[PDB]
Design a protein around this ligand. Structure first.
Ligand SMILES: Nc1ncnc2c1ncn2[C@@H]1O[C@H](COP(=O)(O)OP(=O)(O)O)[C@@H](O)[C@H]1O
Ligand SMILES: Nc1ncnc2c1ncn2[C@@H]1O[C@H](COP(=O)(O)OP(=O)(O)O)[C@@H](O)[C@H]1O
Ligand SMILES: Nc1ncnc2c1ncn2[C@@H]1O[C@H](COP(=O)(O)OP(=O)(O)O)[C@@H](O)[C@H]1O
Ligand SMILES: Nc1ncnc2c1ncn2[C@@H]1O[C@H](COP(=O)(O)OP(=O)(O)O)[C@@H](O)[C@H]1O
Ligand SMILES: [Mg+2]
Ligand SMILES: [Mg+2]
Ligand SMILES: [Mg+2]
Ligand SMILES: [Mg+2]
Lengths: 328, 328, 328, 328
């Protein structure tokens, strides 16, 4: 059971052979109101996004990584597993093991969290990081730089072929949520100084992801009063979003300098952008083109990362020689 | 010039020879109270704590050095410099160079910020990290794992014999602010469900820092309604703060595993704790005593870190051979 | 002036008659820390061994042979010479001549290097093979095969009747350093796979040199992690050290076969072992006893080679007239 | 079965009559990649050159001298045999005897290893030195010193008389590996002080072998930091290999002293140079020309030594009279 548990979607590819491309966020009814009819005993996935105004949303994966459960009872993770795993549970003992995607710098408490749940439910406790699944799934060679841009963290993975873990790699905290804070600051420098929330900032990032080049687009949107309506330009959206590139290429530069000549010379392994970064236009302009410029390596974007994360799930589904399971 | 940035203090050690015990927080007037340009054009220190309800508080440190400057025009930095540096400014044109403490994993954007400030004050921009600044004030031998427990980060950096700088260093995010979040989470799961804020969690941490041992103390504090007042037993304050110790000694263990036999055999040089951590009772119990226990090396607590930060400035005040200034 | 320059010690006896049993290894401070001037411009002796983690210690005697010195200024050897001059400074024209010990197969280029330095410090250059120097100090008869087992090389030299020079003498590269590599090979091919360096392997050899017989000893030492500690057996230390002697007596067999009939009948002339090999227990068992046995010649080990290196200096102080000086 | 076994490449002539110029170095997979002992039962030659970062490489012929295989099972040399010899094995018992090239000064321990391998392949163990292949294949008269300059050994052949095999000959291991050490030290004399590994040192030697004369060439490569690619000059490359020939002709001078009057009078037979050193420009300058000069003897170089190694193997293949094999 290879699951890419992330900040937006939850890509489930079982070993049995079924594909369930489910969604993120877990809530439960904020006050005492209604029975199951109104809400549900915890709400998981798309209905919690649809009812995000009626539920208390308890972070279950802070910064794209298993936290601990802030309710301090392990019920957000329990009802998460109820929705994802129990409702689609194999009825023939398809010898099921569990691989939950973790960020590149995962803690031992996140490993312990997965361990306790694997012992409770009944799954071999395996821990594989998100960019490892990509490097095992997509048939890439060493060294293929993997930049996974989600909402919570930004994983800069460029390990040697031993894949030692968090030794020669760094998980950055500046991600989509950091950009959303800068987008909130960007619209406070406008004339009417709108104060929109994070959900609105996410909508602008999703619909108008034109960061490398000044594509002439605008967000036709309403002001806080509700009657005024105008096309908000993306002049300060470009400025806000392009300020994270320096840190990405600085971490890449620092790592490449410390590697051997054959890992320095990879002007053909490219830099692979996955996640939400694959849907942002103009990220190849900085490295490949003449804009940052950052050397001259080519840049590759993953088409449909949600569908290509199940390839890594399939790769780890077989055969996983028990000897590897004891060693991981 | 040595500036020891911090939440508790922003200490200044001049070349002339004076110690200025200055304080944190920078705001500027959000309303129309007092005068802003003729009274307090930005407010720094204890007056900003005193008037924290009428000022717009735009952090500018975030547990470390230059954060980013949320004004986004060098206005938090400029009026901070006006308060601190221009008030201590030597009048005899003393060969002043700028040494400002940075976190163990400092960025190049922090260096860029230091450079922008160095152009404002025309001084040489020098970059010295805090763990080594402590080992300059307290000249201990190799190697004493200097751990700086502050409000923002927890910097764990062992020392190498040649003292090359922080090449192998750990900066954790779990710090005093993380403890305050856990303290809030603890009292939201109790009988009376206290509704205290972050500053109150910090206040109780400061007044009753008993974590290693169950010393029977109680915090005379107001209940969730606000008028009722009683001696509230600090039972779960010990529990909440206990859970950060594992990570501190895990990073040290990871270093010891990677160290060579010469560096492994250094338990007589002990581990030194500075910052707010050195004012917590029971910190030596885990490592020095027989409670975790963690090995054998003894524990030394820094008394009055403010003074020892000025010792590090004094060490770096002379002679700093221009050749060292070009090389740093 | 006789200098027995080794990897363990540097025995100095002046012409005047004073004994200075000085120490090995030359370093200098590796990164910018402290000041060599304040400490020592290059550090010579056990201070550099004790501070080998603070200093760059570039080998200045690869297997009893001076290196080319990549700095190309010969300042490792000039400060080494200075160290000895500080200990044994000449005053009233101390008829000082330089007796320098060399390995048995030293090249003319190696002698020319020593000659250049002897001309720099104005002294008569007298190149004497180390095995012959031992036979000058400990006056044995012909033919007493002298085997000098050091860290760098193993010098096997039958004493010649008139001692004409390098007629037939052998320098092997397998020595203490080779055995230390085999000790590393032992602990890396065992169950717990201990991770220890050469310095520690040398320490175990020094403290527990029990090779011919299975003396029941154990080395109380820390494991690869560094915290665990236990008494490690010397079963595979005996195996690792066993294979030195076979190669030594292989070369001696070649000498015995090459001897003329009057040199063949020399079983009462025996074989004398010096260096670090004189402090190994069970060495005489291989030859003298009935273990290999290598014939039945008796074995004599040199007691305190450090103290008996000055006896050869005294023998090569006097005499050596204007004909001996022109001859070398 | 005449096998020239080296560290760069091998040369095998079969009884059938085919030339196999196959490559050297043996590893086996250390990281998890493909199948370990099933994808390639130990990895030899060009796949180990291409995949050198995934393999554990354990040399078994340091400087033309068989080691002891530190795995302590002698499986690195046995799988090498199954790679080369078993893959080209006669299927009709083409009377096969094993002729493995040995250094001019081989030990009895090296012969013991040949005997261990001869039991694995069931063939007669024959011991013939490497430069005898050259002197018998390319029939030169007696006595024409042969200097075959390889990576590991530079066997100095001087056909002796009577006694038993090696009477007056010496293996010189001041060879490619020595030059690699000189090159690494010579590029540290540059301004930025390049710090390159052995593979790069070999690459520069192979591409621009200009030593005797100052031919102005340069190699576009990475500097010490390794950011720019610039035409790196060969000023200190000429210096690095300047002290090689002097030491070679030092040994030849010693041979000329040991030669009989008619053996000494062989300047019309010249000195024959082979191996990788035969493709270094300026080789005859030192001896034949007026640069050292070493007298005035003429110099002959072998064209394509790699292709002439099979001619020497063929010469030993036939007829190889059994009476000679019993006597060898
Ligand atoms: N078209 C788009 N342009 C920019 N960002 C997008 C787009 N679609 C989704 N995203 C962003 O992708 C982020 C989710 O991270 P992603 O890696 O795609 O999901 P997961 O973490 O589940 O694998 C969200 O911040 C979301 O706004
Ligand atoms: N007696 C005390 N017990 C516990 N913590 C204290 C005490 N006094 C001060 N502190 C804490 O020390 C912290 C300040 O440490 P400091 O090194 O200035 O932080 P930073 O350098 O990250 O800004 C604050 O969180 C403060 O509450
Ligand atoms: N008690 C001991 N047992 C075994 N070896 C020892 C002992 N004491 C010293 N040695 C070894 O003696 C060696 C020193 O030999 P030395 O003559 O100084 O070397 P070199 O001749 O190469 O200069 C070192 O390898 C050291 O470990
Ligand atoms: N054109 C060249 N110039 C100089 N050296 C070369 C050249 N080509 C190969 N070599 C060197 O020849 C050496 C190997 O020669 P070889 O006779 O195969 O030695 P071995 O038998 O010890 O492997 C290597 O060091 C290689 O770099
Ligand atoms: Mg993800
Ligand atoms: Mg601090
Ligand atoms: Mg010696
Ligand atoms: Mg060869």
């Amino acid at each position: 059971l290879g699951i890419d548990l992330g900040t937006s979607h939850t890509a489930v590819m079982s070993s049995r052979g079924k594909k369930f491309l489910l969604k993120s966020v877990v809530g439960y009814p904020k006050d005492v109101i209604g029975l199951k009819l109104l809400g549900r005993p915890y709400v998981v996935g798309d209905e919690a996004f649809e009812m995000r105004s009626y539920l208390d949303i308890r972070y279950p994966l802070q910064d794209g990584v298993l936290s601990e459960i802030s309710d301090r009872d392990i019920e957000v993770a329990r009802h998460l597993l109820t929705h994802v795993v129990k409702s689609a549970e194999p009825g023939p003992n398809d010898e099921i093991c569990a691989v939950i995607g973790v960020p590149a710098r995962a803690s031992a408490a996140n490993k312990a969290l997965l361990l306790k749940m694997a012992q409770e439910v009944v799954h071999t406790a395996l821990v594989v990081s998100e960019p490892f699944m990509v490097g095992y799934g997509l048939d890439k060679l060493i060294n293929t730089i993997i930049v996974d841009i989600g909402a919570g963290t930004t994983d800069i993975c460029a390990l040697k072929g031993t894949v030692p873990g968090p030794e020669d790699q760094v998980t950055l905290t500046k991600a989509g949520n950091y950009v959303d804070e800068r987008l909130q600051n960007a619209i406070l420098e406008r004339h009417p100084e709108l104060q929109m929330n994070v959900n609105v900032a996410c909508a602008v990032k999703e619909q108008f992801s034109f960061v490398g080049t000044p594509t002439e687009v605008a967000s036709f949107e309403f002001r806080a009063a509700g009657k005024p309506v105008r096309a908000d330009v993306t002049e300060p959206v470009k400025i806000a979003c392009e300020a994270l590139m320096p840190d990405i290429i600085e971490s890449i530069e620092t790592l490449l300098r410390s590697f051997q000549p054959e890992y320095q010379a990879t002007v053909l392994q490219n830099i692979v952008f996955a996640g939400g970064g694959s849907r942002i236009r103009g990220l190849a302009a900085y490295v490949k083109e003449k804009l940052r410029p950052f050397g001259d390596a080519n840049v590759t974007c993953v088409k449909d990362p949600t569908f290509d994360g199940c390839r890594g799930a399939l790769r780890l589904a077989e055969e996983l020689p028990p000897q590897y399971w004891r060693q991981l």
